[PDB]
Amino acid sequence: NNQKVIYVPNMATKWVYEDAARNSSNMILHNLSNAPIITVDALRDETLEIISITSLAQKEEWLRKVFGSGNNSTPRSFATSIYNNLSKEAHKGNRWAILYCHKTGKSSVIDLQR
């Protein structure tokens, strides 16, 4: 039942660790279970990557990286819609969105507070 908790000490600086850590994971599972699920037909691997590691805080940089360039660009209306959806969820004070790509069958967890 209990999730494995692995304490990793820092030499420069246990039931208590385990309790706090399990409570944290459980809170995330709770919030994740209420997160919106954004669904798209297809996403380039590179696009999903940049979305999965890029802060929403600078809108133009997010768009610039997601729009990409030239022959390998991502449609602007489509990228922009993804941003506004993610951003809307973020501004509600919430941390998570799930991004599902049908072509791939793959879901990814997006941290909106990155």
Next chain:
Amino acid sequence: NQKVIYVPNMATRSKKANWVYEDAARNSSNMILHNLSNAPIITVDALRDETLEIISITSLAQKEEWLRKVFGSGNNSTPRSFATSIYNNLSKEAHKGNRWAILYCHKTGKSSVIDLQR
């Protein structure tokens, strides 16, 4: 029943769509939540934010590149031994095929979800 939101990409279609999404997105997400519910939790006393953010976005595939990215700023004061220990614990889980780990900082209570298969 979380909200499902379809974002269309007409530039890539012959024809406008077309509930298959609305239902399949739900299923893959349920599978995610289930696996995450059981993901190992790596817990540390504290971690510099600079180091947390890099760990949360970096592949475990190559250890030397991971360390390279973690200390890329030349100004990261996280002890190298501590960073390496975190890598080894994360890697061990990733080697099992596990997609997910939670990284939890007890000092702050800050908790991040780690994709172990970047």
